[PDB]
Structure 1
Amino acid sequence: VCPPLRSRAYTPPEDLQSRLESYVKEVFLPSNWQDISLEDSRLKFNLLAHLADDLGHVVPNSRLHQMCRVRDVLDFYNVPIQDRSKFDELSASNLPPNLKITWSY
């Protein structure tokens, strides 16, 4: 059976650095954990799979190779993405009183 479709909206959690470093400690230690290199497939997979399971938002294949460091992973996960359609994006943008937008789709 098809579960409810996963909403693509994603808001980075406030304690994102703390959660990320906890996961990094779980997977891999040294100072400046931001600069830990993810060159190892095992470690990269463990970290990214844990993060995806926890936050409900995975690194796409397109960006996957760019995650050279935990700093890159943090950058990817601290940028929000909204799944609202253009209809919402326009209507909920403080339309002036003389502008009316209707959608028949």
Structure 2
Amino acid sequence: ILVCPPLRSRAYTPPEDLQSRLESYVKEVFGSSLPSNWQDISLEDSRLKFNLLAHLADDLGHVVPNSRLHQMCRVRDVLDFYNVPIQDRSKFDELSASNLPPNLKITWSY
């Protein structure tokens, strides 16, 4: 009745208006003012930490793991974390995609 949603890739790439999107979601969650440093407000309050991170995950498809979730005390930490971009291609496929010399061939039994 709710069988088999398709799987999602782990590959991520940050957009170009990422700064503006983080700004907008920070205001929409906080309701506070900008004046000095919007990139320096803390997240000891787990409620707005949850809302900010869950909205970011819903928007961008990338969710902070628990090990990194421990060490996010400032919104600039999540700003740095969202400039990681990682790829979900197999090591085998990246070995192929690299600029292989014409005298090096790779076969596969998997």
Instruction: Return 5+ residue gaps in structure 1 as ranges.
Output: none
Superposed displacement of residue 88, structure 1:
1.0
Query: 1:98 — aligned with what?
Result: 103
Query: 1:20 — aligned with what?
Result: 22
Percent identity, aligned pairs only, is 100
Superposed displacement of residue 30, structure 1:
3.8
Q: Provide the secondary structure at the position in 2 that maps to 1:34.
A: helix
Instruction: Return 5+ residue gaps in structure 2 as ranges.
Output: none
For the residues of structure 1 that align with 2:97 and 2:49, how far apart are their CA atoms? 39
RMSD: 0.9
Q: Deviations over 1:9-43 (max 9, x none)?
A: 00011111110111001111342111010110011
Superposed displacement of residue 49, structure 1:
0.2
Query: 1:8 — aligned with what?
Result: 10
For the residues of structure 2 that align with 1:104 and 1:61, how far apart are their CA atoms? 35
For the residues of structure 1 that align with 2:11 and 2:54, how far apart are their CA atoms? 19
Normalised by the length of structure 1, the TM-score is: 0.96
Superposed displacement of residue 78, structure 1:
1.2
For the residues of structure 1 that align with 2:66 and 2:57, how far apart are their CA atoms? 13
For the residues of structure 1 that align with 2:13 and 2:38, how far apart are their CA atoms? 23
Normalised by the length of structure 2, the TM-score is: 0.91
Give 4+ residue runs of structure 1 displaced > 6 Å after superposition: none
Kept in 2, the 8 Å contact 1:38–1:44? The answer is yes
Query: 1:68 — aligned with what?
Result: 73
Q: Which has the larger radius of gyration?
A: 2
